[PDB]
Amino acid sequence: MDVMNRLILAMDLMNRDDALRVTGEVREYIDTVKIGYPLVLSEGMDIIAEFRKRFGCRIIADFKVADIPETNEKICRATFKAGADAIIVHGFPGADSVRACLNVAEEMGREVFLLTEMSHPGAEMFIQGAADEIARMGVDLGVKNYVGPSVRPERLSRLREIIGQDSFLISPGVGAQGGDPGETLRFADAIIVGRSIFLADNPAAAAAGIIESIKDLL
Amino acid sequence: DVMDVMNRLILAMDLMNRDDALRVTGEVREYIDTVKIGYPLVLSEGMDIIAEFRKRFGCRIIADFKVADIPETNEKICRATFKAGADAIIVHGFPGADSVRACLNVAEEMGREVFLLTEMSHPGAEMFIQGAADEIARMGVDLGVKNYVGPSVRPERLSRLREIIGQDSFLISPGVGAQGGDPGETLRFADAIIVGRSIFLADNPAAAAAGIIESIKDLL
Numbered sequence: 084m085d086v087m088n089r090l091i092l093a094m095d096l097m098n099r100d101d102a103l104r105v106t107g108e109v110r111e112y113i114d115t116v117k118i119g120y121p122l123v124l125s126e127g128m129d130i131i132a133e134f135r136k137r138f139g140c141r142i143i144a145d146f147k148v149a150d151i152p153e154t155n156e157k158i159c160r161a162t163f164k165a166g167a168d169a170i171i172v173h174g175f176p177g178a179d180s181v182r183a184c185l186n187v188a189e190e191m192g193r194e195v196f197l198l199t200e201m202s203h204p205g206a207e208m209f210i211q212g213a214a215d216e217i218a219r220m221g222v223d224l225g226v227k228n229y230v231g232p233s234v235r236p237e238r239l240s241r242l243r244e245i246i247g248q249d250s251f252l253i254s255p256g257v258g259a260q261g262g263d264p265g266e267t268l269r270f271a272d273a274i275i276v277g278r279s280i281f282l283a284d285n286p287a288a289a290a291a292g293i294i295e296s297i298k299d300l301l
Numbered sequence: 302d303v304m305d306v307m308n309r310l311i312l313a314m315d316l317m318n319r320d321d322a323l324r325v326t327g328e329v330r331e332y333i334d335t336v337k338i339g340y341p342l343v344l345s346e347g348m349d350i351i352a353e354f355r356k357r358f359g360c361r362i363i364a365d366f367k368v369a370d371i372p373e374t375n376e377k378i379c380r381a382t383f384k385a386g387a388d389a390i391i392v393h394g395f396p397g398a399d400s401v402r403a404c405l406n407v408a409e410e411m412g413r414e415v416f417l418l419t420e421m422s423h424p425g426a427e428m429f430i431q432g433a434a435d436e437i438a439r440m441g442v443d444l445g446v447k448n449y450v451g452p453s454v455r456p457e458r459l460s461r462l463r464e465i466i467g468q469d470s471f472l473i474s475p476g477v478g479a480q481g482g483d484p485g486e487t488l489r490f491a492d493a494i495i496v497g498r499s500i501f502l503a504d505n506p507a508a509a510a511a512g513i514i515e516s517i518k519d520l521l
């Protein structure tokens with residue numbers, strides 16, 4: 084997966100007008116947008132097709148799928164029908180739930196990203212202790228795409244070690260949550276950035292600035 | 302101090318087609334006044350489906366969104382969900398206390414309820430969730446969570462969850478019917494059972510619901 088400027092926009096604005104305007108403002112800097120439930124639940128799944136029509140970007144549906152296998156399959160079907168190129172799945176609910184997602188993705192020509200460890204403080208309670216094993220489970224299942232936390236580079240590095248250099252790894256928590264763009268790209272293929280761009284006075288200037296700071300990694 | 306679930310039976314409406322979802326829910330409305338709507342239906346038909354159910358049936362709506370993000374995003378998801386008219390939302394506990402608190406804070410501000418999912422009913426739950434479930438439940442109690450979800454298919458685990466949360470907490474339980482859980486046995490511990498496929502895929506969903514209710518008649 085070739086992500087322009089190694090930068091994925093997390094578009095979590097909840098207003099269609101603002102989301103389209105801001106994305107348009109930064110479109111020259113990205114070709115990959117992560118769309119999550121804040122936008123989808125506020126404006127509908129039709130927003131995905133609208134982004135493809137306007138921007139011709141790839142779309143990662145950040146739905147943190149975390150149900151039983153039966154329901155996971157339905158969620159993935161509905162999501163790929165709406166035009167998502169990929170979907171993010173939690174690993175914590177175990178292997179059968181992940182495999183359900185992998186099956187639908189294969190059927191529809193899409194990718195699954197496995198969320199290992201998360202970036203927020205609460206991740207330390209239960210997720211962090213399971214994260215290495217979740218990553219190994221991903222390897223066992225043939226998962227090739229992973230998500231891990233920018234805010235804990237030692238954990239992100241360990242995740243990279245587990246999955247190998249051939250796997251694709253993207254990482255949120257850059258900017259607002261304190262992660263550093265350059266340090267994160269030591270280990271991740273691409274960084275995910277939301278508020279640092281979309282809440283900025285000048286979103287285009289914010290995006291440009293982040294890219295300038297990693298210019299030599301591109 | 303808890304929602305009054307008619308017949309102790311909650312419909313899991315996981316049909317993905319608006320016409321079928323509406324038809325089946327209409328057919329069982331005399332037996333059930335509380336409906337669980339999840340992402341299969343919402344991602345297929347939009348959040349306005351919640352409005353449509355309220356308009357047609359006047360049923361309570363539990364949004365089964367298994368919220369499992371960072372606190373910032375959890376807040377936004379809860380806000381959007383309550384704005385659409387959901388009475389309650391289901392939240393995962395495994396992402397930890399700050400993520401749960403974020404949902405509780407929005408629910409408090411907006412006058413709605415959070416249900417905390419503590420262990421799940423599928424085989425995969427044994428890998429990571431089961432080992433964390435007792436602590437997730439205890440965390441819920443510490444945070445002031447009053448409503449919980451736990452699995453019908455592991456009666457020993459459901460019983461332990463009930464112990465942890467106490468008799469005053471509200472507990473609902475899926476996995477009844479299609480996944481093998483027994484209505485009566487489950488209601489030893491849960492306030493209400495959640496049933497999906499064994500009602501909505503039945504030739505006669507009303508008869509399926511009526512039959513389940515007949516089987517637990519002495520527990521109502």
Ligand SMILES: O=c1cc(O)n([C@@H]2O[C@H](COP(=O)(O)O)[C@@H](O)[C@H]2O)c(=O)[nH]1
Pocket residue numbers: 093095119145200201202203230231232255256257258259260275276277278279370371374
């Ligand atoms: O561990 C994780 C996994 C995520 O998907 N995310 C997501 O990545 C984005 C981060 O946005 P921001 O740059 O504003 O902090 C949000 O959409 C959030 O839901 C995260 O922050 N941490």
Ligand SMILES: O=c1cc(O)n([C@@H]2O[C@H](COP(=O)(O)O)[C@@H](O)[C@H]2O)c(=O)[nH]1
Pocket residue numbers: 150151154313315339365420421422423450451452475476477478479480495496497498499
């Ligand atoms: O542990 C759990 C938690 C759930 O929410 N569920 C949900 O409960 C419902 C079960 O439906 P069914 O009766 O068709 O098996 C589904 O909506 C599923 O997503 C579950 O099955 N197990």
